[PDB]
Amino acid sequence: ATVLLEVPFSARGDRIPDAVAELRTREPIRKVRTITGAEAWLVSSYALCTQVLEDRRFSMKETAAAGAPRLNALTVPPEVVNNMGNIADAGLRKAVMKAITPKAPGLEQFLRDTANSLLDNLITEGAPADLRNDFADPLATALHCKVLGIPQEDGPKLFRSLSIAFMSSADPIPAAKINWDRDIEYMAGILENPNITTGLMGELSRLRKDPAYSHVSDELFATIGVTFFGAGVISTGSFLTTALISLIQRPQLRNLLHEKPELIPAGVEELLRINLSFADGLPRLATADIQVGDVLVRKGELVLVLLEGANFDPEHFPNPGSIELDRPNPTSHLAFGRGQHFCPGSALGRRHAQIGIEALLKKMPGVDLAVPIDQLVWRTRFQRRIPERLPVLW
Ligand code: HEM
Ligand SMILES: O=C1CN(CCCn2ccnc2)CCN1Cc1ccc(Cl)cc1
Known part of the structure; x- marks a missing residue:
């Protein structure tokens, strides 16, 4: 006798388990057990993942x-699970979305300058360099302090909450509440701080005092700061880290992108498609009885949308494990989700990765891992798959 199949399958972000393709072929919606002991439906084909994400009766x-x-x-108060819904209901969606585009004057120049300064510091110190802790994550943190309008010097302390905040735990985490409450207090002070006039927090600070928003709660304004910082920083730093591994392990691609940097956007789109940064499927709860493939999902059941299931599906992306810069459907992957909850930071996340790669390849065209790939230490029971350190030489 064997137990019910457990998720997640592997915390490694450098390879997809052979198990995923076997499941997709045999049982593209299959019962699994989560780390809490709950049962869930794991959905692993492109067609069924799209179906779930586009049907709001599967509720976030x-x-x-x-x-x-x-x-x-x-890891947050339960109302924060409806974060973007609350933002929309407050009339703040357009403003939030405008503040987080990479098109603000000077933002791309800031990203480039930041990336180049980080890389220059690594070059001065000498190999080996850790491209997660001393490149991708500080680039993410600096970008989000700029986007938010908060001091760069406050980034590191906000960042250090994230190794706990984005845990994937069977049980409540006492440290998550301590850090959440602290970070809320910080953002509430930012809204009252007259020096904060730019970025997302500067714009929220003004809307807070406008009559059209007089009944929006101060808790929501503070929450938008904490959540957008955390979500953006963890997602962009983690994606860039694991994309750099995929790139380094493909010297021919690295060389092509170094020689023809105009191909970087197509390259980043393929890196997004093959990315294993999300450690778990995206969760949804059925609010009705809904047919998904061969399974009638019942009201109140949990469904997990496996992004790599969709994004490595050969019926949608032929030769799925290969990076091909000329696919006819390149942005049709699910790396930013799909439907009602499609990532509002998608443009910013593309630009963070494009600029970080462009700068890396110009400064370190010989970049290579400095340890055998199997020696990377993959963080466990976390919402992202990331190596603790990424040691490189050049
Ligand atoms: C490469 C970087 C990123 C990746 C791969 C990524 C991925 C995703 C995915 C897959 C979803 C859908 C979740 C679901 O449907 O359950 C999502 C939603 C979200 N993302 Fe991102 N994201 C990235 C960057 C960012 C950035 C930069 C921000 C903010 C600054 C951000 C904020 C959010 C928010 C707030 C939502 C929830 C939207 C809603 O519920 O309507 N993300 N992201
Ligand atoms: O606002 C959101 C959106 N998340 C979508 C999936 C994760 N993600 C992050 C970026 N892109 C995708 C789910 C959770 N919450 C609430 C929340 C955000 C941030 C913190 Cl620090 C605490 C809670």
Whole structure:
């Protein structure tokens, strides 16, 4: 006898388990057990993943309901699971979305200058360099301090909450509440701080005092700061880290992108498609009985949308494990989700990665791992797959 198949399958972000393609072929919606002991439906084909993400009867916010089967423990107050919904309801969606585009004057120049300064410091110090802790993550943190309008010197302390905040735990995490409450207090002070006039926090600070927003709660304004910082920093630093591994392991591609940097955007789109940064499927709770493939999902059941299941599906992306810069459907991957909850930071995340890669390849065209790939240490029970350190030479 064997137990019910457990998720997640592997915390390694450098290879996809052969198991995923076997599941997709045999049982593209299959029962699994999560780390909490709950049962869930794991969806692993492009067609069924799209179906789930485009049907709002598979609800994000209802995953926070008391008593529901859970992927993992909440790390925020349950209303924050409906974060973008709350933003929309407050009339703040357009403003938030405008503040987080990479098109603000000087932002791309700031990103480039920051990337180049980080790389120059690594070059001065000498190999080996850690491209996660001393490049990708500080570039993410600096970008988000700029986007938010908060001091660069406050980035590191906000960043250090994230190794706990984005845990994927069976049980509530006491440190997550301590850091959440602290980071909320910080953002509440930022809204009252007259020096903060630019970026997302500067714009929220002004809307807070405008009559059209007089009944929006101060808790929501502070929450938007904490959540956008954390979500953006963890996602962009983690994606860039694991994309650099995929690039370094493909010297022919590295050389092509170094020689023809106009191909970087197509390259980043393929790196997005093959990315294994999300450690778990995206959770949804059924609010009705819904047919998904051969399974009738019942009301109140948990469904997990496996992004790599979709993005490595050969029926949608032929030769899925190969980076091909001339696919006819290049942006049709699910790396930023799909439907109601499609990532509002998608443009910023593309630009962060494009600029970080462009700068790396110009400064370190010989970049290579400085340890055998199997020696990377993959963070466990976390919402992202990331190596603890990424040692390189050049
Ligand atoms: C390469 C970088 C990123 C990746 C791969 C990524 C991926 C995703 C995915 C897959 C979703 C959908 C989640 C779901 O449907 O359950 C999503 C939603 C979200 N992303 Fe990102 N993201 C990135 C960058 C960012 C940035 C830079 C921000 C903010 C500054 C951000 C903020 C959010 C928010 C707030 C949502 C929820 C949207 C809603 O619920 O309507 N992300 N992202
Ligand atoms: O606002 C969101 C959106 N998330 C979408 C999936 C993760 N993600 C992050 C970036 N791109 C995708 C889910 C959770 N929350 C609430 C939340 C955000 C940030 C913190 Cl620090 C605490 C809670």
